[PDB]
């Protein structure tokens, strides 16, 4: 529902997401408030607070960052910044006595997601990654049919997420390297489709295969992996194959097969809209609804649906298949994960 | 092989970076979020090129407050039935899509063109022939444009099934059969207007039957002369005391072509719609459904063709009004056109009420051609 | 091969589709033949290998009584013939197998009925639809309720009339065929509405149009609309045309599904197909079911009198096209054994 | 106007009436009365124009009975295996159509070659890359053409993903994805000849993943030059004792283009191939059904845009296009050289699927006329 209010939020990083996806997702917001903004650009962050209407002394950028902790008005951060520094500031935050909205992938190594959840304990505050899927109508639809038996057994699940990466947009720019981005298409999107199985079938993956490929011609694949492709196998017996891509166009699908009928999503992780059907032989905008969804659960004292936790294991199963990719044998990854309160 | 400037220069510790890329001249308010709008319209957007949801009307401010959350529309710009004519000071909005119960259409196109607004209503236009003139007046007197929701008129299927008759590939044409139904009451009786007389107008013919009538002119490209109707409900259902469940209406035309048609509250889908000529048979099936028509060809001896974007109804038809304004053209389903089915519609009551044939050569003039 | 055939008449359906149709006959042969041209009839004769020693006309016709070996005799001449042979071929001690529509009158059709009776013979009428594996098919899955409970059924049968075509000429005239489309092909619409509904029409309508300038409608009819209500209360609406392409297509709405006939009524290659929200050709199975219901001492599944209610229902129709007023037609009918 | 000149005359009389009207230069043999043969391919001659049903050859004498009638077809032309060979008289029959098991494919191809006569055998070709190859040899022999079942070959609709990818309407193809399944009978499966081993090849891959195999091929108009799999059965599931449930593959293209695909015998109807350039993407979805296939265009920005005569004729043009070849010197589209490239690849890809390690398959098959 439209007019927000309590939880108030600290924006970091004026990107393409922040300013294309989040800022216009408070408008929808019951509960969650643009309170401040954390960014390297005055000029910028000038013109984003008259938009907003952010008082202009809530600007920090990067240094004073800290000092949100003298301001009671700021209850969380929102970290809208590359990879490689969800963790400094996520931590920074923590210590600053404020909740932590993190954008997936939650860092660039497994040894910084724990460090993150490390810190959030230590401060007595919660930790949540910004996956958007977890509070999007039509994905939860498809996970609900799945659990209301509509598919049958589930035994092959397909998946595909790709987009064109263009040097000149500043927010690709840094997803080219791999210092920023710790690695590539699988890291930015094909987390989409590896997070998505695994709600999707309710199951962790106990082992992994992979291969990667690059035009080593291809400026943009110098360091970082344009097109992966991973293979997985759960517990239950079902199956799944997927990709990504950073050099074909626009693709978001995902399949569900199962011996009662097929579940088809597509698009099945957008901005927008998103289209779910089944073949056999109303709801708030997932932006608001997430952000509403921490305020929700500091203001109420309850589980957030994507913690930390969540965002440690993606990363853990992105290693192993980076590694299955690179040794080209399978990869075990029954190491127990649990899911918090269900996928 | 080197890693382009733009990315190797990007620092690695925090820094401020530039203004991001910003990942539609013509809006709309829409009025009644119900099924249609919610299911169809709202989403249909996506793919326009010219339009745009601009403002929600809605008798239901929660409704509007998640939808306008759901689409990006200014919560400001969510109005009642009350306020509505606010509008008028709103130069953004550009035209008025009304998607309500049909007894309300022209009560709501009438305000709109009141408040300087260009309107896209859907079908039936009205539920009298009279209302249909109220509205076609009130827009020339405002001098704004008048278009009824004829999505079939913008369905590539329905549009490549009028080209393929028009260039005499099915020959002299001599027996349309259309047939348009769906199950009514989900247990609710009185609670669906579509089944009060006051609110609907009629029964499944106002609603469903219209496609085949509608479809069979188009197909055609001409009008009856001559109608005959019967209808029956089963005097044992609730759902139809006011409203007809199936009626069943024929008809003839003034080259000699001949139809039948019917449309039903309590069969299982369907649209069908069906083209005889002396070289060949048409078969249009789903010949109105919302995602994919199919149309197929069988010429005698031969076997069964299938005929061949392909799906962009929604779409097509928010445009076209839009560019029909910006580009100052003639809308191709004028006002004119949805009275001349509500007109006809009448006739069929008539016939199916009298049990006669009701002459119905009053000479309407479709302009622009089917 | 115990049951004999006297096919009188060789013209289209004969020799086009039931002379080749005994080639898959298992109790049936085409013991004689019946002409008015014993040169085609000798080529014929010839071919399928019949003994040109029976090859009579219409007029020793008779003879037949006296060939024991001749079980039964199929006509297949114009309709305004049918009720003729059938008798002078029942005054024989041959069964009996006349073509659609059974003949030109309620009258006549009775007057075949009785001869029937009196020759302690049996009287089936052509209507290979009865004998068509895909037909019965959708029957069934109506029966096993795979539709839900019927409302709306749609018929439409129609074929360009050709006044150049021997087999057609008769057809233009109304002494010979009897009335047009309607009673040459729209009666498989009719009779598949009945038993696809598994039920009778109580109420008739209809509406009938032909251009007044072309001269193959100046006797019979070109297209006919005929609309139908039930006892259960299910509608149907269905046509047939003389000046509109071949089509072949029945629909039959329920409120848990639609069945989609098309072709409904087609030679071969027929097809059904049902929407939510290996045994012998039709022609063969004809035959030798005749041959069948008289070995077994049994009753044939298109009796005379099933025959009898279309051109009593169809009189009904173009009474009602002719008055633009409903005619009833709730007259008892019982369509003996099933539909 | 009045009644036509001799409509208006006919005796209202019993009379004499001339000879009435009239109504495929190819004989067909169809060998194997089953499933597809009956309720795909004969019904399939309808819309034929140069083929037609000349003989039958059925294990079944009631079966081919009432089927040879039903067709209207010479009672006198129903041959059983034994007699097989016997058909080398008769030369009303053109070409054989073989529709049996896997396991008996070249056996029957080599038997009617024997016979000169040409061949159109089903897929897969046959049951190892050695008995393609004497296919092959046998037929270059009797001078006459060898065809494989390749439908989609022939579909319409597939055709036209083809053409539109070929203007470039995609772009540069990096990405390609492919899923054939559907659920295997489970009631006494030891009685079914694609869960036996010796019958059928292999499983899923063999029966229907092979649509993925080859769809990846002609979409991207090139072949694997390396290929990887795996595979899993459920261990306590009795259907898959011989052969595989599920298999999974991923392969590279000489132009860089990747895919994966896989091929399911327990999971429901499937049958999508997805197609991703750099300019936009090609959904095909049903791909390879026997009825209305469809392919909708994804292109960046602009929304799904559905591709849409005649379209629905595969299996008429498959038969004809044999037709047409011999009638008129030319070559097949589908010769037994494009069936062995896919069993060499699928042993290729069952061997992936065994070591674990990627297998070059860069041999330097070429296509012979196009994709
Ligand atoms: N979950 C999802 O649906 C999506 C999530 N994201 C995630 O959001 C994050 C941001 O991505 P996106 O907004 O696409 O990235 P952009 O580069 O558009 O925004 C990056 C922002 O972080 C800042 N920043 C500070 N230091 C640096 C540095 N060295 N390099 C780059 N930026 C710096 C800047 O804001 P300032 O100039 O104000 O300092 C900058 O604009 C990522 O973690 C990404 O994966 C992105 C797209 C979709
Ligand atoms: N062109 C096409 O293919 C189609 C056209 N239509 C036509 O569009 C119109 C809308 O149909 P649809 O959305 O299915 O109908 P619904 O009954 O689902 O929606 C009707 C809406 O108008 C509103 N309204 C205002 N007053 C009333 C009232 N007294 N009773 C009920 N609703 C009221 C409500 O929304 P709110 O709560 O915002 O006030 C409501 O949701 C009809 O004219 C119909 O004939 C329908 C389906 C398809
Ligand atoms: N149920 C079905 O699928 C079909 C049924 N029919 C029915 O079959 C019957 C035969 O029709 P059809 O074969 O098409 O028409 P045709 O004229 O081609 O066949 C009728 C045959 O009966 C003869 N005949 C005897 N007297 C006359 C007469 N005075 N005028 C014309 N013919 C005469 C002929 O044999 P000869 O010259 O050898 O004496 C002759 O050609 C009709 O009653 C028709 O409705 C027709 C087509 C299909
Ligand atoms: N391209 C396509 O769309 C399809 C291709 N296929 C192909 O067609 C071929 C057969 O498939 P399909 O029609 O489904 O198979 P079925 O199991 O229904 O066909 C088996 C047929 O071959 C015969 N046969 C001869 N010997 C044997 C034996 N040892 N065991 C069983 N049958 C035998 C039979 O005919 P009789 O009883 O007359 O002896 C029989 O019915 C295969 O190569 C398969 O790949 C199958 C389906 C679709």
Redesign the interface.
């Known amino acids: 529902?439209?007019?927000d209010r309590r939880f108030g939020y600290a924006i970091v990083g004026?990107?393409?997401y922040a300013?294309?996806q989040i800022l216009?997702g408070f408008?929808?917001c019951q509960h969650s408030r643009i309170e401040a903004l954390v960014?390297?650009?005055?000029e910028?962050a000038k013109?984003v607070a008259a938009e907003y209407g952010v008082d202009p002394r809530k600007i920090y950028?990067?240094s004073n960052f800290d000092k949100i902790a003298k301001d009671p008005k700021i209850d969380a951060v929102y970290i809208i910044?590359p990879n490689?520094?969800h963790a400094e500031?996520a931590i920074r935050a923590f210590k600053a006595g404020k909740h932590v909205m993190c954008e997936k992938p939650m860092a660039t190594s497994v040894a910084d997601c724990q460090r993150m959840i490390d810190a959030a304990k230590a401060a007595n505050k919660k930790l949540m990654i910004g996956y958007r899927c977890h509070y999007d109508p039509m994905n939860r639809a498809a996970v609900k049919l799945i659990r209301e038996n509509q598919?049958?057994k589930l035994?092959?699940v397909?998946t595909?997420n790709?987009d064109?990466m263009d040097?000149?947009?500043?927010?690709q720019?840094?997803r080219?390297?791999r210092?920023?981005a710790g690695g590539g298409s699988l890291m930015d999107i094909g987390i989409y489709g590896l997070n998505g199985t695994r709600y999707l079938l309710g199951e962790e993956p106990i082992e992994v295969?992979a291969?990667t490929?690059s035009?080593?011609?291809?400026?943009?694949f110098?360091?970082v992996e344009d097109?992966i492709?991973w293979?997985m196998?759960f517990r239950s017996?079902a199956?799944s194959?997927?990709?990504s891509?950073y050099?074909?166009?626009?693709?978001s699908?995902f399949?569900v097969?199962?011996?009662?009928?097929?579940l088809?999503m597509?698009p099945a992780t957008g901005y927008?809209?998103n289209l779910i059907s089944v073949?056999?032989?109303?709801?708030?905008?997932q932006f608001?609804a997430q952000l509403d969804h921490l305020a929700e659960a500091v203001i109420n004292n309850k589980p957030v649906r994507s913690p930390g936790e969540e965002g440690m294991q993606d990363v853990r199963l992105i290693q192993a298949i980076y590694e299955a990719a690179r040794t080209?044998?399978?990869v075990n990854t029954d190491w127990g994960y649990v899911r918090q309160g269900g996928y």
């Open positions: 529902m439209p007019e004026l990107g393409k300013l294309n216009p408008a929808g960014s390297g650009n005055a910028k013109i950028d990067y910044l490689s520094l500031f598919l049958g035994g092959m397909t595909d790709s064109v040097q000149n947009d500043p927010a720019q840094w080219l390297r210092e920023l295969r291969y490929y035009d080593p011609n291809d400026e943009r110098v360091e097109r492709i293979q196998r017996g199956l194959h997927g990709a891509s050099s074909t166009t626009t693709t699908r399949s097969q199962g011996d009662k009928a097929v088809l597509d927008y809209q073949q056999t032989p109303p709801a708030n905008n608001s080209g044998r399978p």
